[PDB]
């Protein structure tokens, strides 16, 4: 028996599967939230999107074990940039946190990411994770259309929507 | 002159310019929502960044006027398929609604949208807008970069991300 099984277990027992609504309950039950403002649902939608890989709208347990790790990894990397444990982070001190944990972008590119997600000036922990989660799946999408291994991908119109809207 | 000024006037004189928290209000104040539930703020950042080239987190009244009209039209098509007055519409009903209002999307593409934005087999009115919103701002970005005029645009990894994280 894995410890993370139980949180996942009690929510949606038979399918062996959880959607965003099911996912949200069991994350914050297990305290990956970890003191901070517990994950709201439209964040959890992306997490599901990221990891289903079949358009199921759901992810099973070993897909769930995988997630908990990524969010722990990212949770601590947040706590570095807000050791006061307020909830928040200013956009510029966020700017570095973005660059650090990998696969990063230029000072001109990074701003775009902190411009959009800046909620009343500050950035929330929920906004932070939700940004990471959105990008990971965008990298992982870009990856799989970049069969050439270049870092430059041709996008048709219908393909570009079909891609971007799924995440 | 214009009846839409009062609703807008009430919400902000930041300059003569509103944010999402304000926009949310004046929409529901104007009752474009129209029986259905107020457009929630998760949607109403899209509505800013859709018509915000200058990354301010703001739109103005003349931009607003565009928005309200697009919605008044979009809303109408929804209410074709929702003679219920329910706030819910099936993902076939959605697929056809996307066609009739002028989107060049394939069988495979709208499937991949409809799948995503559905949650228990039907789509909320709020969701249908945020789907429709997202389309029209991503296609405006694709046509912004398609001065190739081909139906194909080519994307660096640092450009592809900074495109999709703005919306
Ligand atoms: C999210 O991860 C990825 C997933 C799939 C493909 C990619 C990447 C990726 O991160 C990536 C890069 O970070 C870089 C490049 C790249 O092609 C990719 C991917 O293709 C080259 C680069 O010049 C580009 O601007 C083009 O994207 C800059 C950068 O170079 C970095 C990493 C290079 N491998 C090399 O070590 C160079 C010296 O620094
Ligand atoms: Mg799955
Ligand atoms: Mg701080
Ligand atoms: Mg305000
Ligand atoms: Mg503007
Ligand atoms: Mg119906």
Numbering used by the authors:
A (entry chain B), B (entry chain A): 32 to 198
Quoted passage from the original study:
Sorcin is one of the most highly expressed calcium-binding proteins in many tissues, and part of the 5% most expressed proteins of the human proteome (PaxDb). Importantly, Sorcin is overexpressed in many human tumors and MDR cancers. Upon calcium binding Sorcin undergoes a large conformational change that exposes three pockets, hydrophobic surfaces involving the EF loop and EF5 hand (Pocket 1), EF2-EF3 (Pocket 2) and region EF1-EF3 (Pocket 3). This allows Sorcin to bind and regulate target proteins in a calcium-dependent fashion.
Here we demonstrate that Sorcin binds doxorubicin directly and with high affinity and that it changes its cellular localization upon doxorubicin treatment and limits the toxic effects of doxorubicin in the cell; the low resolution structure of Sorcin in complex with doxorubicin allowed the identification of at least one chemotherapeutic drug binding site. The asymmetric unit contains two dimers (A–B and C–D). The structure contains 10 Mg2+ ions (3 bound to monomer A, 2 to monomer B, 3 to monomer C, 2 to monomer D). Doxorubicin is bound to the B monomer. The superimposition between the Cα trace of doxo-SCBD with the Cα trace of apo-Sorcin yields an rmsd of 1.11 Å, indicating that the structures are similar and therefore neither Mg2+ ions binding nor doxorubicin binding are able to promote the conformational changes induced by calcium ions in Sorcin. Inspection of the Fo-Fc electronic density map allowed the identification of two peaks: one close to the EF5 hand, which does not bind calcium in Sorcin and is responsible for dimer formation, and the other close to the D-helix connecting the EF2 and EF3 sites at the interface between the two dimers. We succeeded in modeling the doxorubicin molecule in the first site (close to the EF5) whereas it was not possible to model the doxorubicin molecule in the second site (close to the D helix) indicating both the low occupancy of the site and the flexibility of the doxorubicin molecule. The binding of doxorubicin to SCBD in pocket 1 involves a stacking interaction of the drug with the aryl ring of Tyr188 of one monomer and interaction with Asp177, Gly182, Phe173 and Phe134 of the two-fold symmetry related monomer at the dimeric interface. In the second putative site (pocket 2) doxorubicin likely interacts with Trp105 and Phe134. In the structure, magnesium is bound to EF3 and to part of EF1 and EF2 sites, showing that in Sorcin the first three EF-hands can bind not only calcium, but also magnesium, with rather high affinity, and that EF3 is the site endowed with the highest affinity for divalent cations, responsible for Sorcin cation-dependent activation.
